[PDB]
Design a protein around this ligand. Structure first.
Ligand SMILES: CCCCCCCCCCCCCCCCCC(=O)OC[C@H](COP(=O)([O-])OCC(O)COP(=O)([O-])OC[C@@H](COC(=O)CCCCCCCCCCCCCCCCC)OC(=O)CCCCCCCCCCCCCCCCC)OC(=O)CCCCCCCCCCCCCCCCC
Ligand SMILES: CCCCCCCCCCCCCCCCC[C@@H](O)O[C@H](CO[C@H](O)CCCCCCCCCCCCCCC)COP(=O)(O)OCC[N+](C)(C)C
Ligand SMILES: CCCCCCCCCCCCCCCCC[C@@H](O)O[C@H](CO[C@H](O)CCCCCCCCCCCCCCC)COP(=O)(O)OCC[N+](C)(C)C
Ligand SMILES: CCCCCCCCCCCC(=O)SCCNC(=O)CCNC(=O)[C@H](O)C(C)(C)COP(=O)(O)O
Lengths: 175, 178, 88, 56, 53, 68, 459
């Protein structure tokens, strides 16, 4: 349905085979689905139609809240408490959004594994690669901060990683 | 379980107990009835061979060898009656046994049902109450001055007496209460 | 349902039945109040065998301290009745 | 007759009255921390043609 | 109280975070950028010490 | 034949269970009926974009009517 | 947040102005109303706390504790009116006053923005508890217990005070927000080591830590039922809350200063779980159970990870509810038979079936059956410890077995078997006791339904 974007949560084109009977005996599954349809699916559809008719007469809306971008922790003086507070809150919001991104990728991976059946080791390599990249980036960003994490500790971790990478590059250029 | 124990078991009592245990374990070994009867007769002859020993020391020494032989040749998994202290139903119904004094705490609505039963209960309680002073005095009279020496209790001897300490023996819950 | 409500008459009948199949007692000479050592001339081993036969017949064990005291068929019937909560 | 009822059950308004007094004191405390009202970089906003303050 | 707690408004911003993540995933997948970056801060605003020797 | 079965007093446990059920239902059946009525006749808000120049109230950022 | 503080200070004169036979009703009704009011603090944010004023604030870690305290007060009131029936009116009002003052001090402690104010309130909580224990306890050991309860606390807390003022002369502020934002690493020097010890030992002795726990069995055994309830369910969580708060300024010293305390916590958790296996006193068994659970919480706080903090918060809430229920269940039997020996009254399932059901549910929750919040906290802590070091799964696993054993042991000792013959004064369970059990147990599963309310700020 149009409830969720089909780009963020993609799916294959869903090819299914046609019924090709070969036996003269009746298919009990066919009569069972017909009975289930006529006995369950239609009253439920009528109830849902009534509920949606009632909902259509009372239409009100809710909105996604928008947040501006404030200066980061790098643009804050050492003891400026107000800027530190705003940057810290922005960092926490970004951390939550990154967690949800990882959640989306993991849901994609799980759905692929269930969907592809017995070919999942070959037919879901792309989802595994996306999860590998996202997990590596997330681990480099937020791992080992521990309880009492903050934007300052994340910045210190990034600076340490940057120093290590710069030293490695400068010594490799010497080779 | 009903009889008061003694300070010790006599030699004859020990011999009889060993005889019964040997017969039961031999039956556990010999499943079929005819084979069991054959070997039980053999065991009976073996027992009554040394029945007439006037030397008590040699008798107790023979009993010692008998116990050693029984312990070596006992059945590892002897047959136990289901309600015996080793059986599969030993204490199966103990969870259904409720003491009678609990009925004293029933709500009057519960006691509204079964009126005649509670009338009989009142009669029994009155009889116990009347009986208690006499039961205590009889136990006081019949006790040796150096305290009781066994766990046996005297019967009732007077015209309308009751045997002392009878309430909890008479009002046992049941063997199959619920 | 389950087993019928065993009665005193049934217990006495079963005990006398078991005793009358014993080769060492005379069925005519045996009565409900006949003593094992006095009237019937049995020894302690025969009494143990009789107790074991009663145990087999009724399917429950009698402790040795209690079994030592039962000397007449009436006593055996009474012990069984008090053990199994039989009053009629 | 309400005299006895009141003199017996007037202790039942102390806690609700304390609740209302606490709410009022919380509002009084809130009114003394408005130095940054509509001044944060994240929530700074233009006033509506009628409203005077973004929050109380 | 259980009814009140069950219907507490989402002040933890879970649904908002999910929608923000959906937007960002859609954008970065459409334009081919990586889904996440190992750096949470732009290196242009970070000034490393001049000398490492 | 029928005998008397000795049991502890079952009046008080039954009374407590009945009272607890009565009070829980007394306050919870109206709550369930009201929740069902609200769900049926006042559905959830539909997600939409903020129109230009509009500043929504805070409770407008939630979707369920009871939460709002 | 004065909307919660003021109604308790109003509970005070309402109790002191009540008619002689209406104190319990008024106190219970208005305490339940105050709990309903305090229920609104569960609506927390995802980024920062609820900064009500310069003095008080509410966080996702303190709101469940406040709700638990305000919910526990009425339960204490119901559990206390049985054994205080023969008391005079003035002494009953004094007892209720002690309970109300304890609740007020705990409420102000859990929301103080300032560490010295937190110290003052967290130390003020001693006086009502000490008075309750030494005045309304039953046996002559109570006096000694009070002393053991007092100095054990004070010897741990007086150094902390010094450390606190020292910090305020160095950083200039003890406000928690400024302390968090202006945090700086602790160097590796002897002075910093002793400052760490001074900041930690008070909360470690209030947990209590293994080896420092000797006061707890005395205090929880000689106290009245309400005293035991408040000591086990809330007053032990002061140490956990204080450690979670104060650890923000102790990094990275903790990285190696936690080794002796981690070792003590794990081995003493095993030791106290084993001690529970041979206990002739039923109250002491519950006390040592509390010691084991709090050792687990100490490990979780000491390893300093988000999953550990979540599990620790859930475990504190679940342990508070469960231990209070267990103490009340034991007190019912004590009031019936006037003895605390576990093997005295046996086979109580035959005589009290609904009480046996309450016992079964309490024991099942004590051994962390899924999906109870006890299990959620324990499993989160165990996963965090496994990440810390794979070998911990041995010791933790050991504890998981032992707990179950002793838990079921208690049940099998008290409810199953055959009833004692000479005990004939076991009356049917009152509606008050059944209601107490239900009000203890229903919130546990209701929180199981929505577990994110007790998972703390790291959620
Ligand atoms: C999955 C089942 C779904 C069931 C749907 C309906 C559920 C109703 C739940 C009601 C709320 C709990 C009440 C607990 C207190 C007891 C109240 C009482 O006194 O009743 C007496 C009343 C009258 O009896 P009586 O004649 O007075 O008997 C007194 C005698 O003492 C004789 O007493 P007795 O011998 O009858 O003892 C009472 C009985 C039952 O009494 C109890 O034990 C109640 C407490 C159960 C253990 C709780 C601790 C474990 C943590 C579970 C957390 C689940 C919380 C879910 C939310 C619950 C919100 C309240 O004992 C037992 O049956 C065994 C108890 C141990 C059960 C172990 C189950 C393991 C977990 C199973 C799955 C749980 C999660 C489900 C979801 C999983 C994923 C789909 O009997 C009843 O009303 C029925 C008893 C309740 C049985 C419920 C057991 C299954 C339900 C599990 C939790 C509910 C899940 C519902 C959502 C679907 C999932
Ligand atoms: C006596 C015999 C009993 C047996 C028979 C019983 C008959 C059936 C009754 C049992 C019910 C079965 C449970 C099945 C689950 C249905 C309920 C569930 O769906 O509700 C949850 C809701 O549960 C509540 O959130 C949990 C209740 C809160 C608990 C607070 C306890 C009250 C406070 C008292 C003091 C607390 C002390 C402890 C300190 C913390 C849903 O959570 P959520 O995913 O969100 O909902 C999403 C949709 N919303 C948000 C729009 C609502
Ligand atoms: C009953 C239970 C109560 C609770 C128990 C609480 C546990 C408290 C234990 C304190 C933990 C550690 C304390 C000090 C940290 C290191 C300990 C020491 O052994 O390590 C070496 C210390 O070296 C030597 O051990 C010197 C210390 C020897 C003197 C200490 C006395 C120890 C005796 C133990 C008595 C038991 C104490 C508890 C009494 C109740 C490290 O070498 P060094 O690099 O140089 O010191 C680091 C500090 N620097 C960086 C400033 C230099
Ligand atoms: C299954 C494997 C285990 C096999 C164990 C069995 C093997 C051991 C069999 C041999 C042991 C003996 O005979 S040991 C023989 C012990 N010697 C004596 O007893 C001599 C004195 N006689 C008496 O005491 C009484 O006459 C008494 C005999 C009790 C009769 O009692 P009553 O007349 O008043 O009923």
């Amino acid at each position: 349905p149009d409830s969720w974007d089909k780009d963020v949560y993609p799916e294959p084109p869903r090819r299914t085979p046609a019924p090709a009977p070969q036996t003269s005996l009746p298919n009990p599954v066919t009569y069972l689905t017909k009975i289930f349809d006529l006995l369950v699916d239609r009253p439920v559809t009528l109830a849902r139609e009534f509920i949606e008719q009632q909902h259509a007469k009372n239409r009100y809306y809710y909105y996604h809240r928008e947040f501006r971008r404030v200066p980061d922790i790098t643009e804050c003086e050492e003891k400026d408490i107000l800027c530190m507070f705003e940057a810290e809150m922005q960092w926490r919001r970004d951390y939550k959004v990154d967690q949800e991104i990882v959640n989306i990728i993991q849901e994609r991976l799980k759905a692929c594994q269930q969907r592809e059946g017995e070919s999942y080791r070959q037919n879901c390599a792309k989802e595994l690669e996306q999860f590998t990249q996202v997990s590596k980036a997330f681990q480099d960003r937020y791992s080992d901060l521990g309880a009492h994490y903050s934007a300052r500790k994340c910045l210190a971790k990034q600076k340490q990683r940057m120093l290590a990478e710069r030293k490695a590059a400068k010594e490799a250029a010497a080779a | 379980a009903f009889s008061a124990p003694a300070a010790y078991l006599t030699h004859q009592q020990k011999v009889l107990r060993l005889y019964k245990r040997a017969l039961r374990h031999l039956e556990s070994w010999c499943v079929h009835r005819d084979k069991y009867r054959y070997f039980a007769c053999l065991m009976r002859a073996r027992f009554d061979e040394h029945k007439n020993e006037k030397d008590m020391v040699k008798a107790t020494q023979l009993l010692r060898q008998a116990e050693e032989e029984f312990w070596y040749g006992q059945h590892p998994q002897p047959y136990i009656f289901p309600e015996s202290p080793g059986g599969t139903s030993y204490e199966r119904y103990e969870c259904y046994k409720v003491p009678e004094w609990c009925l004293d705490d029933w709500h009057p609505s519960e006691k509204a049902m079964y009126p005649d039963y509670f009338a009989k209960r009142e009669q029994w309680k009155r009889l116990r109450r009347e009986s208690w002073e006499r039961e205590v005095k009889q136990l006081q009279e019949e006790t040796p001055p150096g305290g009781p020496r066994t766990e046996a209790l005297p019967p009732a001897r007077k015209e309308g007496d009751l045997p002392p300490l009878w309430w909890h023996i008479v009002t046992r819950p049941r063997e199959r209460p619920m | 349902s389950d087993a019928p409500p065993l009665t005193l008459e049934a217990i006495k009948d079963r005990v006398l039945y078991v005793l009358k199949l014993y080769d060492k007692i005379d069925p005519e000479k045996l009565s409900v109040n006949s003593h094992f050592m006095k009237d019937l001339g049995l020894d302690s081993l025969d009494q143990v065998e009789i107790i074991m036969a009663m145990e087999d017949e009724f399917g429950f064990e009698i402790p040795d301290i209690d079994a030592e005291k039962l000397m007449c068929p009436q006593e055996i019937v009474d012990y069984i009745a008090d053990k199994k909560d039989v009053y009629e | 007759n309400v005299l006895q009822i009141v003199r017996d059950h007037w202790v039942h308004i102390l806690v609700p009255v304390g609740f209302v007094f606490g709410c009022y004191l919380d509002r009084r405390s809130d009114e003394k921390l408005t130095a940054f009202r509509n001044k944060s970089l994240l929530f700074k906003r233009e006033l509506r043609p009628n409203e005077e303050v973004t929050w109380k | 109280g259980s009814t009140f707690v069950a219907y507490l408004p989402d002040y933890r911003m879970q649904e908002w975070a999910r929608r923000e993540a959906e937007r960002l995933v859609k954008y970065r997948e459409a334009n081919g950028l990586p889904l996440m970056e190992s750096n949470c801060f732009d290196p242009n605003k970070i000034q490393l010490p001049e000398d490492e020797d | 034949k029928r005998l008397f079965i000795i049991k502890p007093s079952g009046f008080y446990d039954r009374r407590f269970l009945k009272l607890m059920r009565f009070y829980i239902l007394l306050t919870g059946i109206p709550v369930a009926i009201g929740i069902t009525l609200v769900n049926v006749f006042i559905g959830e808000a539909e997600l939409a974009d903020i129109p230009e120049g509009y500043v929504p109230e805070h409770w407008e950022y939630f979707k369920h009517p009871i939460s709002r | 947040m004065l909307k919660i503080i003021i109604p308790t200070t109003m509970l005070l004169p309402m109790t002191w102005m009540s008619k002689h036979n209406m104190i319990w009703i008024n106190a219970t009704v208005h305490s339940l109303l105050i709990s309903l009011i305090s229920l609104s603090l569960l609506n927390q944010l995802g980024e920062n706390s609820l900064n009500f004023s310069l003095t008080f604030f509410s966080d996702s870690l303190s709101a469940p504790l406040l709700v638990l305290t305000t919910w526990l007060l009425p339960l204490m009131l119901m559990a206390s009116q049985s054994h205080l029936s023969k008391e005079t009116t003035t002494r009953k009002k004094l007892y209720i006053t002690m309970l109300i003052l304890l609740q007020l001090f705990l409420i102000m402690t859990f929301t103080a923005t300032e560490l010295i104010l937190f110290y003052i309130l967290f130390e003020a909580t001693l006086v009502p508890t000490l008075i309750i224990i030494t005045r309304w306890g039953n046996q002559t050991e109570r006096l000694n217990a009070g002393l053991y309860f007092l100095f054990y606390t004070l010897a741990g807390s007086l150094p902390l005070l010094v450390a606190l003022v020292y910090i305020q002369n160095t950083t200039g502020s003890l406000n928690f927000l400024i302390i968090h934002y202006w945090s700086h690493p602790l160097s590796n020097s002897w002075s910093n080591i002793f400052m760490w010890l001074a900041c930690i030992m008070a909360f470690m002795v209030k947990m209590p830590l293994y080896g420092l726990h000797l006061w707890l069995p005395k205090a929880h055994v000689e106290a009245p039922i309400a005293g035991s309830m408040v000591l086990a369910a809330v007053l032990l969580k002061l140490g956990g809350y204080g450690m979670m708060r104060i650890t923000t300024i102790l990094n990275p010293l903790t990285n190696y200063m936690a080794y002796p305390f981690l070792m003590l916590s794990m081995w003493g958790m095993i030791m106290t779980s084993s001690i529970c296996l041979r206990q002739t006193d039923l109250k002491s068994l519950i006390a040592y159970s509390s010691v084991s659970h709090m050792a687990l919480v100490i490990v979780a706080i000491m390893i300093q990870t988000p999953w550990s903090f979540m599990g620790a918060t859930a475990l504190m809430i679940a342990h508070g509810l469960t231990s209070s229920m267990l103490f009340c269940l034991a007190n019912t039997n004590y009031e019936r038979v006037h003895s605390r020996t576990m093997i005295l009254a046996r086979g109580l399932q035959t005589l009290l079936p609904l009480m046996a059901t309450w016992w079964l549910v309490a024991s099942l929750t004590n051994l962390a059956l899924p999906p109870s919040i006890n299990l959620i906290g324990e499993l989160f802590i165990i996963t965090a410890s496994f990440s810390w070091s794979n070998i911990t799964i041995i010791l933790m696993g050991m504890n998981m077995m032992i707990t179950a054993l002793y838990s079921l042991y208690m049940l099998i000792t008290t409810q199953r078997g055959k009833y004692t013959h000479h005990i004939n004064n076991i009356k049917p369970s009152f509606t008050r006791e059944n209601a107490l059990m239900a009000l203890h147990i229903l919130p546990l599963l209701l929180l199981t339904l929505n577990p994110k309310m007790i998972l703390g700020p790291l959620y």
